[PDB]
From a paper:
Translation initiation factor 2 ([name]) is involved in the early steps of bacterial protein synthesis. It promotes the stabilization of the initiator tRNA on the 30S initiation complex (IC) and triggers GTP hydrolysis upon ribosomal subunit joining. [name] is also responsible for the fast subunit association and 70S IC formation, an event that is directly coupled to the activation of the [name] GTPase. Here, we present the crystal structure of the eubacterial [name] core as the individual apoprotein and in GTP-bound and GDP-bound forms.
The structure of the apoprotein was determined by multi-wavelength anomalous dispersion (MAD) phasing using selenomethionine and was refined to 1.95 Å resolution. The G domain contains two rather flexible loops (switch I and II; residues 97–103 and 130–139, respectively) which adopt different conformations in the apo, GTP-bound and GDP-bound states. In the apo state the side chain of His130 is not visible in the map, indicating that its role is nucleotide-dependent.
Numbering used by the authors: 1 to 363
Amino acid sequence: MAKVRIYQLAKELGMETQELLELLDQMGVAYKSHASTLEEKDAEAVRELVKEQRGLQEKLAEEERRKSLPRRPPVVVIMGHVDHGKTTLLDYLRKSRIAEKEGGGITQHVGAFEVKTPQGTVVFIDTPGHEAFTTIRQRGAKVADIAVIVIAADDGIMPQTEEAIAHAKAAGAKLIFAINKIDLPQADPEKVKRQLMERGFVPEEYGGDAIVIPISAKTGQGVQDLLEMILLLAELEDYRADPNAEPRGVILESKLDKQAGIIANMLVQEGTFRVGDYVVAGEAYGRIRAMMDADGNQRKEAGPGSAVQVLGFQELPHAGDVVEWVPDLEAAKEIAEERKEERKAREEEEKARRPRTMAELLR
């Protein structure tokens, strides 16, 4: 403290000689060499300035950390004609998880499952519908990043295929075309490619931008390439999300468990939902009483990419509705109620203008 030579003070503070001499120059403190003695007031001033500077270096480095959001896994939906193999592929992927069971392990159906891979994890949506609207249409907060369109090599592109493609494009998904059943004798992948090109999807093979991957969902051939391609796209699109943002997710589906009551499966997209949070999804609200993930584990928290079954909604939420964190029960009720009475007011819109004329009837 008093009196200290500059070399002593440098040792004390873990600074290089020239580094401390540079600081003394900044402060206008004079010295002959690092062997000079500092007045106590100067040394104290040094110790304080160094403390401050080191703290701001740290604060400045910690804020540069807090703006690189962590990666989140790609979310994938598998689509196409019901007989072309999307179901066989989804089943293959779901099985590929367990790898000679556990056992048990257990498993729970929460609307999506994860496929873990040396290159990363992929989330596959696994729900019986598409979302809502017509059959099988979607609105539809965006759920999936990538849509794998599974087309049978024998049958080729059909109307369910075209519907799947239009839905995926409408939802903003990146498309991967998976040409399935390639082992069949009547397999005609080249015809499917021509059909893709007729529709404006030119395969990369021919210098276009459409991603086309041959697979066999029955045997698993090509499925690994499909996963690697999903994960490559994820790295290039660079999907990220803030686990500390206000929680936001999307309802995948909801139902009544006779014992537990209203359950809803939701995919988390931003922030981290926690047991005890209030949420609103459309006109439905509740306190999150419990969350269970696909491995059957009770979760206190669910961050980006997690699919969980949530207990606590007081009415069935709709598929495709955004789940939003709110600060308390009062806010949950106000938001839900304002949406209800607004829908009810635009319903009186069509109970008035324009239902048009009435009844040209029997008998």
